[PDB]
């Protein structure tokens, strides 16, 4: 699986984001769920240079779009 460049993509890594890789242990899927905006914060500071953001509102409205028309919904 592993076959790309040095760093993972963005989708993937929102995704990891969840906490899928974690103990946790009861089903925390099933209705419609929501994450925090603390996460689009430290992504977009992992990844703020990129797409030539302005300072944080664009690359805000970007992990946004990720976190939102993928699943879960994000609360900004």
Same mark, same amino acid.
């Given at each position: #699986?592993?076959?790309?460049?040095?760093? =993972?993509? %963005? +989708?993937?890594?929102?995704?990891? +984001? +969840?906490?899928?890789?974690?103990?946790? $242990?009861? =089903?925390?899927?099933?209705?419609?769920?929501?994450?925090? &905006?603390?996460?689009?914060?430290?992504? %977009?500071?992992?990844?703020?240079?990129?797409?030539? %953001? @302005?300072?944080?509102? @664009?690359? #805000? &409205? #970007?992990?946004?779009?990720? @976190? &939102?028309?993928? $699943?879960?919904?994000?609360?900004?």
């Amino acid at each position: #699986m592993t076959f790309i460049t040095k760093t =993972p993509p %963005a +989708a993937v890594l929102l995704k990891k +984001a +969840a906490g899928i890789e974690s103990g946790s $242990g009861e =089903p925390n899927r099933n209705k419609v769920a929501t994450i925090k &905006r603390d996460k689009v914060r430290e992504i %977009a500071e992992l990844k703020m240079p990129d797409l030539n %953001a @302005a300072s944080i509102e @664009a690359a #805000m &409205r #970007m992990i946004e779009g990720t @976190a &939102r028309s993928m $699943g879960i919904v994000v609360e900004d």
